[PDB]
Amino acid sequence: KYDSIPVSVTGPDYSATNVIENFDELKLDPTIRNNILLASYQRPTPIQKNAIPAILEHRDIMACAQTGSGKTAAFLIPIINHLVCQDLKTAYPKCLILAPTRELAIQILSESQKFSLNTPLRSCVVYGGADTHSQIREVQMGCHLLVATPGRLVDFIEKNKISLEFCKYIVLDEADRMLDMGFEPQIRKIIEESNMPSGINRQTLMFSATFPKEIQKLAADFLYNYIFMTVG
């Protein structure tokens, strides 16, 4: 009736030791951004305890973790909080999140909105399908944060609706799913062929439930001295 479930974790590789957290309070961030509690985040999930500090240190990351482990919050909290602490036609996202499906993309936009409550942050989403209101959302509050599928992003970029010349934070959610769906061309395009800030000017984070050879490569081509962490 009462026992502990053991969840395996491993997150070492470079200049990074036990810098983990246990409470969200262990972290410094805008009092309002503590919309985290209203979002029902009571404590840090394993992936968040090991990845948030790393992310907060401007480090790239290759995190293996499945859906339902707190992944989304892990990469939106540090980023959204940073953008809000600087508090505020073609759009120029400051952060980009790449998702496989419109479903994931919508869920991520929603969490971001939850975390953005009563903040100047403008979040936008773009995905294949039938919706030109995405065009207007993009024309409007040229979101500081964008959630999109690789193909539609490319369409919007090629149509000069969206520019990544100021995008310094990028996340590939469910990376394995995107390669399987055949998005590597788009991701390669978006990442290395779209004038997106490079080198120490960009922080790239990767999340995948699985770690195939292709994802091991993607990681080799795109992350820099990345921290590898796995949960489960």
Alpha-carbon gap, residue 182 to 84, rounded angstroms: 34
* Tally of domains in the chain: 1
Alpha-carbon gap, residue 190 to 176, rounded angstroms: 17
Q: Provide CB contacts within 8 A for 140, sequence distance 6+.
A: 122
Q: Three-state SS string across the chain, please?
A: CCCCCCCCEECCCCCCCCCCCCCHHHCCCCCCCCCCCCCCCCCCCHHHHHHHHHHHCCCCEEEECCCCCCHHHHHHHHHHHHHHCCCCCCECCCEEEECCCHHHHHHHHHHHHHHHCCCCCCEEEECCCCCCHHHHHHHCCCCCEEEECHHHHHHHHHCCCECCCCCCEEEEECHHHHHHCCCHHHHHHHHHCCCCCCHHHCEEEEEECCCCHHHHHHHHHHCCCCEEEEEC
User: First and final CA of the chain: distance in angstroms?
Assistant: 23
- In the chain, what's the furthest Cα-to-Cα distance? 59
Alpha-carbon gap, residue 11 to 46, rounded angstroms: 11
Phi-psi region of 68 (alpha: psi -120 to 50; beta: other; left: phi over 0): left
Whichever domain contains 38, its CATH number is 3.40.50.300
| Residues facing residue 206 across a β-bridge | 62, 172
| Residues facing residue 95 across a β-bridge | 145, 169
Q: Which residue type occupies 22?
A: N
- Which resolution in angstroms does this entry have? 2.4
User: Residue 148 sits in which domain range?
Assistant: 1-232
